[PDB]
Structure formats: C-alpha cells, structure tokens
Amino acid sequence: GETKIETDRRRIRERMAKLRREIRDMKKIRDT
Amino acid sequence: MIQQESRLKVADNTGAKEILCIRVLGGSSRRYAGIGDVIVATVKDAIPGGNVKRGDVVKAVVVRTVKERRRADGSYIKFDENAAVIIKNDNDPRGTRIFGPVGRELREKKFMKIVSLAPEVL
Amino acid sequence: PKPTKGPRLGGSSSHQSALLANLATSLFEHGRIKTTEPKARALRPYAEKLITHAKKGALHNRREVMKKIRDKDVVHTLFAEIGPFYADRNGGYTRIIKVENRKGDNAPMAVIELVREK
C-alpha cells in the first residue's frame, strides 16, 4: 500500500471502538 | 515460594493429580505463595474416572513447599514437594481425604477442616 | 595466610602459586633476594609459615614443606640450619628493606632478608 491506507485501517478500527464506547455509556444513562 | 506457572501435586482425592497455578490471591501484584496461601489453579492431569476433569479453573491452598519457611520460634519446616488441596468458596476441601503430612501453619489461617483430615500436622 | 585482595601477581592464581614457591626456594638458598615491592610483601607471610614448620621439625612437618617448595636441597637447609637457628626467636624471621626503583618501568623495588641478629 504505497498510498498508505494500511495505517488508516487501525485509525478506522479505533473509531469503531470509540463509537462503541459512546453507546454503552448511553446504555448507562437509560438503565440508571 | 510457589508463583504463577508453577505445577503442584494435588494431595486431595478429588480426582486431580497435578495443577498449574494461575494466580496468587491475597493482594494486587503478589508474587509468592507459601504454606497457607490460596491460589487459583487449572487441573493439568486427572485420573480417568474422576470427579474433576482436566481443563477447568479451580481454587486450592498450598499445604507443603520445598523452600524452607521460618517460624516465630526461629525453627524451620521444609517438605520435599509442593502440594495443594482443592477447596471451595467456603474454605473447606472438595475431597474427603488428605494425603501426606501438612504444615502447622494451616491452623492459624483457619483451615480447620483440612488440619483435622490430614494424617500428620507438622 | 590471608589471600590476596586484588588481582594476583603473575596474571593468574596458578602462576602466583608457582611464583611464590620459587621466591621462597631462592630466599632460603641465598639469604637475601631483591625483587619487586609487592612481590616482597606477598612473600613475607608465605615464607615465615614454612620456617615455623622447620622449627617444630618432625616427619610430618618435613612432608608439609615438601609439598610447597618441591626442592630437596633447600628443604634440607630448612631443617638443619634455618630451623634450629630460630629455635628461640618467636615470629618475625624476615625483614623488608625498600630500595631504589627500576628503570624500564619504574616499579617499586625492595630487598627481603632473613633476620640474623640473635
């Protein structure tokens, strides 16, 4: 990948984790 | 001095034959477990018709150690193998018979049932 | 005697054990040898131990010296002249005198004797 998106995949995967961490916090708002 | 990854010979009759220590309970980042310290183990070897089968996480207490252990009098006790007795969550043996002598130190740590079933408490 | 604290004299412990015997074999033969200053200080406790063996001369002490010096003409001198000479003086049979250094390496240099005063 000379275009160098092989580093963006771990940037894109991380964004999925942070967005997942968003929803579980909202799962704490309604449950409480 | 039994730590993580150590293998101990089970002195019970639960059907286990040898365990591998997973963790030493007692505090955060604790290293060694002597006579009377509770470990978390995995059964690496069991008899065929056994009650407990290999590959399950179970809790146990050391009863013998190879490294000599001090006593407040200034005298020492030292066995010739590391051994453990599988206990449940209320500090009582899962097995019904204990094999070989055990250390006196289980008395002051409130392992009352293990001490009574042992052949010789030293 | 108490072992050498630092590195040994001849570049190895095996060499020093053979170097300290040759210096004692030559002290009892001539009576005064001149050598390097740290070689003289290391020889002095080594040499006075053998002369004690000479004083209490028995077959046992003849064999104890013979396992160090390995020579058979010095060990006769050690058990016929040196021993009986110091039959009364208690310890301190040698003296160390400091002399002018060498030239090629400026090493400290001393001469070591046998006490012949009494």
């Binding site: - | 020492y76 030292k78 010739d80 070989g100 002598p101 030293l122 | -």
Partner: protein, 113 residues
C-alpha cells in the same frame, strides 16, 4: 571466644546430649494450640549442625507418609525440653545432603557398633 560473650553466656542452655550428624534422635518440641500446651516428638536422623554457640543449629530429617520432611531447630531453643539420642550413626561427611535423594533401603544409615 568472641567479643559478644557476656550477652550469650546467660542464655546458653546446658545438658544438651552430645550428638553429631548421622545420629538418630527424637526431639520433644513444645506446641501451642487452642491455649493448650503439649509436646510432639519428631524422630529422625541428624543431617546438619552449624555451630554458632548460642546460634547453634541442627536439623532432623524424617520420612513420613511417603513424603520426606525436614525440620531445623536452634540447639539452645526453649521450645525443646528434651533431646534423646537413640543410636550412633557411622558416616564420613559432616553435612549429609546426599540423603535427600535416597528413598527406602538406600537411605539406611550404618550403626556405630
């Protein structure tokens, strides 16, 4: 002969029987359990003795229920009221660490007739 002698002289404990490595002995160690006091006899051979005067130390090796135990005591300890040598061993060492790998008949010590 040491500088600290006066301090250790009072604590010294007499009437210790003369025993050396190889002897079989039984030590009457006191034990406390549930406020009760009794004695427990530990019988085995003496495999070590590390002199210090008051700091003297000897160990007794026993094979019990298929497991070999050892137990190190101070010679002048007050938790020991009796030491009774039984037999006289006939050995050639002074520290008997070779007994730690012999089981059964091979671990029998000779007797000093």
């Amino acid at each position: 002969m040491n500088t600290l002698d006066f301090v250790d002289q009072a604590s010294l404990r007499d009437d210790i029987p003369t025993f050396s490595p190889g002897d079989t002995v039984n030590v009457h160690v006191k034990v406390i359990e549930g406020s009760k006091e009794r004695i427990q006899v530990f019988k085995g051979v003496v495999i070590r003795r590390q002199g210090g005067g008051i700091s003297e130390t000897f160990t007794v090796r026993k094979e019990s229920y298929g497991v070999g135990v050892e137990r190190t005591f101070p010679v002048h300890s007050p938790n020991i009221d009796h030491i009774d040598v039984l037999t006289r061993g006939d050995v050639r060492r002074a520290k008997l660490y070779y007994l730690r790998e012999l089981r059964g008949k091979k671990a029998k010590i000779k007797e000093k007739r």
